[PDB]
Amino acid sequence: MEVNQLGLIATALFVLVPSVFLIILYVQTESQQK
Amino acid sequence: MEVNQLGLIATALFVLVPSVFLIILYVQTESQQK
Amino acid sequence: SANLWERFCNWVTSTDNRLYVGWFGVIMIPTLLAATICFVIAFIAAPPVDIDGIREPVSGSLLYGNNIITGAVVPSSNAIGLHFYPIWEAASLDEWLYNGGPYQLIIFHFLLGASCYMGRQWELSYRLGMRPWICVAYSAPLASAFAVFLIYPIGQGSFSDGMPLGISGTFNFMIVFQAEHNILMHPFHQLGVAGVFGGALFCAMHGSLVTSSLIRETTETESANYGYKFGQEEETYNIVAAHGYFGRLIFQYASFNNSRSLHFFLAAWPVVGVWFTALGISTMAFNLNGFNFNHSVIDAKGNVINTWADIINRANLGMEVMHERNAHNFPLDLA
Amino acid sequence: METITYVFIFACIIALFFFAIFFREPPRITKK
Amino acid sequence: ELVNVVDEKLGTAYGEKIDLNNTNIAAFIQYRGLYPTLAKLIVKNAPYESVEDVLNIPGLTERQKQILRENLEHFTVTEVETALVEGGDRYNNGLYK
Amino acid sequence: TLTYDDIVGTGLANKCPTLDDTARGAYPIDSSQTYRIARLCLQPTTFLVKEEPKNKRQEAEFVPTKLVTRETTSLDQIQGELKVNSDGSLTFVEEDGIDFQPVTVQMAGGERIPLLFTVKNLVASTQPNVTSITTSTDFKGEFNVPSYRTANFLDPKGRGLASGYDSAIALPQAKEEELARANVKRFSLTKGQISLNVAKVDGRTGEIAGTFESEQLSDDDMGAHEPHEVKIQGVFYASIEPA
Amino acid sequence: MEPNPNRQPVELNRTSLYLGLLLILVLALLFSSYFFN
Amino acid sequence: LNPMWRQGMFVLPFMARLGVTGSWSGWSITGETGIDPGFWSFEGVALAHIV
Amino acid sequence: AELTPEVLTVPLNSEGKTITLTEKQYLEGKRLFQYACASCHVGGITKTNPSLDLRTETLALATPPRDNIEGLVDYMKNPTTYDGEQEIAEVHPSLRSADIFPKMRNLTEKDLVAIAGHILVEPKILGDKWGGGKVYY
Amino acid sequence: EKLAFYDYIGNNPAKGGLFRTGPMNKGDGIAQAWKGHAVFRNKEGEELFVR
Amino acid sequence: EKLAFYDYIGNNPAKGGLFRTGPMNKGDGIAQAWKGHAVFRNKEGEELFVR
Amino acid sequence: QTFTDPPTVKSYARKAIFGEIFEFDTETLNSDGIFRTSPRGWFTFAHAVFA
Amino acid sequence: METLKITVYIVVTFFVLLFVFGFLSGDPARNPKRK
Ligand code: CLA
Ligand code: CLA
Ligand SMILES: CCCCCCCCCCCCCCCC(=O)OC[C@H](COC1O[C@H](CS(=O)(=O)O)[C@@H](O)[C@H](O)[C@H]1O)OC(=O)CCCCCCCCCCCCCCC
Ligand SMILES: CCCCCCCCCCCCO[C@@H]1O[C@H](CO)[C@@H](O[C@H]2O[C@H](CO)[C@@H](O)[C@H](O)[C@H]2O)[C@H](O)[C@H]1O
Numbered sequence A, B: 001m002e003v004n005q006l007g008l009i010a011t012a013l014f015v016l017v018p019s020v021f022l023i024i025l026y027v028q029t030e031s032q033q034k
Numbered sequence C: 001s002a003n004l005w006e007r008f009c010n011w012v013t014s015t016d017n018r019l020y021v022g023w024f025g026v027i028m029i030p031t032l033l034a035a036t037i038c039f040v041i042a043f044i045a046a047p048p049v050d051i052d053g054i055r056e057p058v059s060g061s062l063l064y065g066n067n068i069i070t071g072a073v074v075p076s077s078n079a080i081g082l083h084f085y086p087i088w089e090a091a092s093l094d095e096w097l098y099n100g101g102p103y104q105l106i107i108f109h110f111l112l113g114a115s116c117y118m119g120r121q122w123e124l125s126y127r128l129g130m131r132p133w134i135c136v137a138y139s140a141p142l143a144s145a146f147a148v149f150l151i152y153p154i155g156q157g158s159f160s161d162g163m164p165l166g167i168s169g170t171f172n173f174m175i176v177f178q179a180e181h182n183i184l185m186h187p188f189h190q191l192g193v194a195g196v197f198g199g200a201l202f203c204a205m206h207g208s209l210v211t212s213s214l215i216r217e218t219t220e221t222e223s224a225n226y227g228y229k230f231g232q233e234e235e236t237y238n239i240v241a242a243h244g245y246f247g248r249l250i251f252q253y254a255s256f257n258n259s260r261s262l263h264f265f266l267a268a269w270p271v272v273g274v275w276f277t278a279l280g281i282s283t284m285a286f287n288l289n290g291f292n293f294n295h296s297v298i299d300a301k302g303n304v305i306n307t308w309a310d311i312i313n314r315a316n317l318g319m320e321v322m323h324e325r326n327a328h329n330f331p332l333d334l335a
Numbered sequence D: 001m002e003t004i005t006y007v008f009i010f011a012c013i014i015a016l017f018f019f020a021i022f023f024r025e026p027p028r029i030t031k032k
Numbered sequence E: 001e002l003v004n005v006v007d008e009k010l011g012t013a014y015g016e017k018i019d020l021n022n023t024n025i026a027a028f029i030q031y032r033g034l035y036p037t038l039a040k041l042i043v044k045n046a047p048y049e050s051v052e053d054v055l056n057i058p059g060l061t062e063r064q065k066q067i068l069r070e071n072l073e074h075f076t077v078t079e080v081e082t083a084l085v086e087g088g089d090r091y092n093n094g095l096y097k
Numbered sequence F: 001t002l003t004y005d006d007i008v009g010t011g012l013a014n015k016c017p018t019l020d021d022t023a024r025g026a027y028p029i030d031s032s033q034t035y036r037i038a039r040l041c042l043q044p045t046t047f048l049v050k051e052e053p054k055n056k057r058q059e060a061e062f063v064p065t066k067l068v069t070r071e072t073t074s075l076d077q078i079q080g081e082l083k084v085n086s087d088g089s090l091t092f093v094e095e096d097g098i099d100f101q102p103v104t105v106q107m108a109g110g111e112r113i114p115l116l117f118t119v120k121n122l123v124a125s126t127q128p129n130v131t132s133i134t135t136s137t138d139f140k141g142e143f144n145v146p147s148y149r150t151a152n153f154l155d156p157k158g159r160g161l162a163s164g165y166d167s168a169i170a171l172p173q174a175k176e177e178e179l180a181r182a183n184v185k186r187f188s189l190t191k192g193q194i195s196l197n198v199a200k201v202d203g204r205t206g207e208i209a210g211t212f213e214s215e216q217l218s219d220d221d222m223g224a225h226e227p228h229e230v231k232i233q234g235v236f237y238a239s240i241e242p243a
Numbered sequence G: 001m002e003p004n005p006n007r008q009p010v011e012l013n014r015t016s017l018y019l020g021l022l023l024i025l026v027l028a029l030l031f032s033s034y035f036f037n
Numbered sequence H: 001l002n003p004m005w006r007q008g009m010f011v012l013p014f015m016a017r018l019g020v021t022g023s024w025s026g027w028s029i030t031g032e033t034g035i036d037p038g039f040w041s042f043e044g045v046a047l048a049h050i051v
Numbered sequence I: 001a002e003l004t005p006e007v008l009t010v011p012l013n014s015e016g017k018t019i020t021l022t023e024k025q026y027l028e029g030k031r032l033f034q035y036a037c038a039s040c041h042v043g044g045i046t047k048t049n050p051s052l053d054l055r056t057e058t059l060a061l062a063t064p065p066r067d068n069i070e071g072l073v074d075y076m077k078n079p080t081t082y083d084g085e086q087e088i089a090e091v092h093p094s095l096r097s098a099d100i101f102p103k104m105r106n107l108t109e110k111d112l113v114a115i116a117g118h119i120l121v122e123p124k125i126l127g128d129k130w131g132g133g134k135v136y137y
Numbered sequence J, K: 001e002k003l004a005f006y007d008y009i010g011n012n013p014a015k016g017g018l019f020r021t022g023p024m025n026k027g028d029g030i031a032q033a034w035k036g037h038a039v040f041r042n043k044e045g046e047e048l049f050v051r
Numbered sequence L: 001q002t003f004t005d006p007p008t009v010k011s012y013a014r015k016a017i018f019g020e021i022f023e024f025d026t027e028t029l030n031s032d033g034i035f036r037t038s039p040r041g042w043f044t045f046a047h048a049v050f051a
Numbered sequence M: 001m002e003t004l005k006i007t008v009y010i011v012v013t014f015f016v017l018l019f020v021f022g023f024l025s026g027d028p029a030r031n032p033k034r035k
């Protein structure tokens, strides 16, 4: 339709970036010995 | 100019996704005890 | 102070610097920062350049409609030829950017620095007690930049005929070159591709032979790389097993067993081949071109019997006849 | 929009360069 | 309406015969004894209102007038077209072999 | 007197000769003796480009501009007869000479404005009754401004007027009405106004000097876009001789 | 150089990952409409 | 009729409020020509900060 | 597919009479044509003035006719413009100007006849190629 | 013109929206010129005024 | 019509490019109708043919 | 119908080159007039590579 | 503009001197053994 061109990328990075953040931590936590 | 609308998001995810991959590993490696 | 200058010279020359700023470096570091900084700005924001001196500006920067693949830094004007065009030679920058001033500022500083870069590849080897000659391997790729950025222009009478600084701009340099010199049909270029093809070939040979004949010291589920520690005494691969396999692939005497002779060949081949390729461009810079076998084989009556050499000439004419649309006013292309 | 994307990646490669040269894993001898 | 004056000129006399007011000088090399001397005079002597006006170029020797009379059937004349006359294009229009 | 080498590279070659502060005399006209101009010369000093008043017609003025090409502006070697007229006036009529030079100037925005600074087919005239040429003895007249680029010039995509492509061959099945203007090349031809007003005479050698002001249009690029109005101010030098 | 003694390790439990993601995703479900506007 | 505040300019104004009102390319905020901003043009300011 | 004496039969003079060259003259002309012409007439064109070629038809409409041994021969001795209304021996090699164009000194009437024969024989073998330029290469 | 332009609600910062992105120009468009003052009158010649 | 349509180089899979994305319609456009067979002739009535 | 004004004739001649001449709707998809390949083509490229 | 020329010139001289007076400073000396 007649939507915003950047809407897609704004929504994509809005989800990816912080999700990628959490995930990087959780996995580095999860793999800490003992 | 008269470029492709998806070009931006195609380039963004093409860089982010795999970079985010490596990074998740490196950090989880890096934080392994010993 | 043991003596400032005495000290300075000890630092410069110090082999304890993360990056060895040498004596050659004192010239390198600045020239290279200028070349690089001017380029990056040019490539991104420079405006159209009247490369062919016919007032027909070719814009080659990102902000002016180009993308990484098409964009480039355009060569100085043909109106300028071989004349020196330093910024202080223009009524204004506007005038300097229009006649392709940035091009010279870049090629000159780069070529200058890239040479010192060679001078440095010697110096450090000296301060470290290692044999020289590495810098001599680097003389090949350098001798090319030189041939493509300076010799060819000197020879042809203008910097506007030097290779542009961009992807597509380079293909242009090539396609036209071929048309005016028929380089593919020149011994030196052929030696060039032998060296490059060969190099990549050998690069793969060595690479595989060695990697394939590594002594086992790693787990089944452990990177085979860990089987090596920086600062080892003995070797990490069975060069005798390597030679054993390769000698059987072809035949024994046609295989290396002397790592030193192997590595000399490994370096000698590409460097020698590229040296010739660089001499090719430096030679065709004075119009001594490739073999011209046009209409050689002719029949019993005199008719011309074509060879692939002729099919090549047609493709060349297409290039000749179409390059620089509006720049020619006369019959023969003597420039 | 395109210009920005091209310059960004470039700027990212130069950043990488920096970290690679000045923040590599110091290369240690013998012991490993 | 925007039209390419030249491609349009090719639909007139020009395009069928040597145009004394437009056609480039080299065109005269396709007929006996017109080239060097006469073609220069014809071209040099501005436009013509009618083919015959060529017979009137001042100085033409009696023999030249003879020759001209012979080749008139190969000439015509149309409005002077700038795109074809400007730039001295009638003495050299950038075409060779 | 300076040989070639005495000028080469100085830029001096692109400068019309000059008369000294002394030479402020007057040259006589026999009116019964044909005269010609052995050498007219025009040197630009400024190029002003009238700006488009945007939609809001508010009256537009001329603005200075930077010369992006270099010292290649001067017109020299102009020549023709300077016939004396019945009413005692003089009209110069050019025949041949380096009567045009392609110039390119930039603007506030960064826009390059190319023009074919010329005086081809000049027809300058003076005041009626002009027995002797005194300081400031205005010459005024028109000339022709031929298309900037000639018939054979091809655009970046191969299209041309006298030669080249018929259309946008890079877009084989695109609608054409929109591309019309850029595929069909037109050759522009227009008139120009100039006025050579004397400042220094020198009846002795018959060589006058002064300043000029001319107006003309710039390149319309084979008629792809509108031409800009240009004004040009500079100086000139003429060599009058009986001949 | 001396191993800087002011550093501690960082942690994010599984539940936090989930609570985190639930927030990111829904905010995205809430704002995408206005981004596409 | 088309001043910086119509063009979603946000930083450009804060640079004019204190002096920088020209471009190395020749134009200027007030609309004058022939002016020489010198080194401290919008380009200059932008250049400076990046360094 | 050969250079028969049938192909080496070219017009001698204006009145139709012909002459027949021999494989020796031909080769010899071809060699002489290279020695004193190719420089500017390589392949039947004319580098210092592309408007006039050596195509037989072009030579036919020349003035006087230069499309026969007699013609070309005269030309190599006293050259003229396409209308013949002007002698150009001063800027075109010829016998009457060998002091200025040395390459023309050796040249004897025997040689001039061969060169001439070559010009009429070439287009017979090559055809369109001989006249046109790079378009036909 | 400049003066007339300030008397246009389309330059009032109070008009607009949170997700109505960009310059003021993506809205009503790039201002080109002042059409002029509009005076409304009715059959009787009376001058009317627009609220 | 269907038959005539297959005789159009714009349906030849060999035309195209690697980054010329999308359906065939983003190219020459959505086919609407067959204009008809075109026969070219020259003054003499002779029928010509387009290579 | 018949057409005789050079331009129109040439237009169609310029089209004859691709075979049967058709009428396209370029608006809808905002086409660019540059040929793209058919599914037959893509499937073929993709599988020849993967293989 | 005539200034920039001057400056550039100065700047290049500095470095070029630093360069000559450098290898001159008994460079052979600088190295592992025999000096
Ligand atoms: C800090 C103040 C600030 C301000 C006042 C502005 C103002 C402006 N900018 Mg700038 N900008 C800024 C910072 C700022 N910017 C930064 C840091 C950047 C770098 C990315 C930019 C990059 C930038 C660009 C590239 C452009 C502008 C442009 C503009 C103009 C845009 C009009 C518009 O569309 O706004 C839109 C305002 C919004 C969309 C705000 C909505 C925020 C909501 C959606 C999300 C909040 C986050 C999250 C969901 C909250 C949840 C929390 C949780 C705990 C619940 C405007 C005058 C444009 C321009 O110049 O046009 C001519 C233009 O092209 N700006
Ligand atoms: C496996 C074969 C396959 C094939 C033959 C097709 C074919 C087609 N698809 Mg489909 N598709 C596929 C898989 C496939 N698809 C998958 C897995 C998805 C899910 C994402 C889709 C989603 C999809 C959508 C959403 C659409 C299509 C559409 C189309 C048509 C598109 C025309 C086009 O633009 O191509 C373009 C082809 C390319 C851009 C390929 C270039 C690949 C290069 C750039 C990168 C390779 C990667 C990397 C850089 C390599 C480096 C390696 C390193 C080691 C060096 C076409 C007939 C479109 C349609 O129906 O239009 C009407 C459409 O809208 N497809
Ligand atoms: C007109 C010119 C104007 C110039 C102005 C600048 C003057 C000089 C230097 C200071 C400015 C900051 C420099 C940053 C240094 C650094 O990172 O290295 C820091 C290291 C650490 O050692 C070191 O650092 C030591 C001290 S400490 O770690 O700071 O305490 C110090 O004692 C020792 O001598 C030193 O080698 O230094 C070096 O090994 C020497 C490096 C030389 C520089 C390289 C230039 C190369 C250019 C290449 C081109 C491509 C790149 C393009 C990029 C745009
Ligand atoms: C045609 C034009 C020719 C122009 C020639 C111009 C020559 C100008 C100067 C010659 C200078 C010789 O200068 C002298 O060199 C010796 C090295 O040999 C330097 O000695 C230097 O090297 C030693 C190492 O060997 C350092 O520890 C010391 O700190 C350093 O100064 C002297 O400090 C310097 O003063």
Ligand SMILES: CCCCCCCCCCCCO[C@@H]1O[C@H](CO)[C@@H](O[C@H]2O[C@H](CO)[C@@H](O)[C@H](O)[C@H]2O)[C@H](O)[C@H]1O
Pocket (backbone or CB within 6 Å): C087, C091, C092, H033, H034, H035, H036, M001, M004
């Ligand atoms: C990192 C390296 C950076 C290197 C930067 C090198 C810059 C070199 C030269 C800058 C020269 C600027 O030179 C200056 O330009 C301006 C126009 O902008 C000219 O014109 C300006 O001054 C005159 C008066 O003299 C005014 O009437 C005019 O309106 C004004 O624009 C000046 O006459 C010229 O002297």
Ligand SMILES: CCNc1nc(NC(C)(C)C)nc(SC)n1
Pocket (backbone or CB within 6 Å): C202, C205, C206, C207, C209, C239, C242, C243, C246, C254, C255, C256, C257, C262, C265, C266
């Ligand atoms: C040590 C393995 N033997 C071997 N032999 C050879 N012989 C040629 C002629 C290809 C250089 N090459 C290699 S790889 C550089 N290795």
Ligand SMILES: [Ca+2]
Pocket (backbone or CB within 6 Å): none
């Ligand atoms: Ca404009």
Ligand SMILES: [Cl-]
Pocket (backbone or CB within 6 Å): C052, C054, C056, C324, C325, C326, C327
């Ligand atoms: Cl060109």
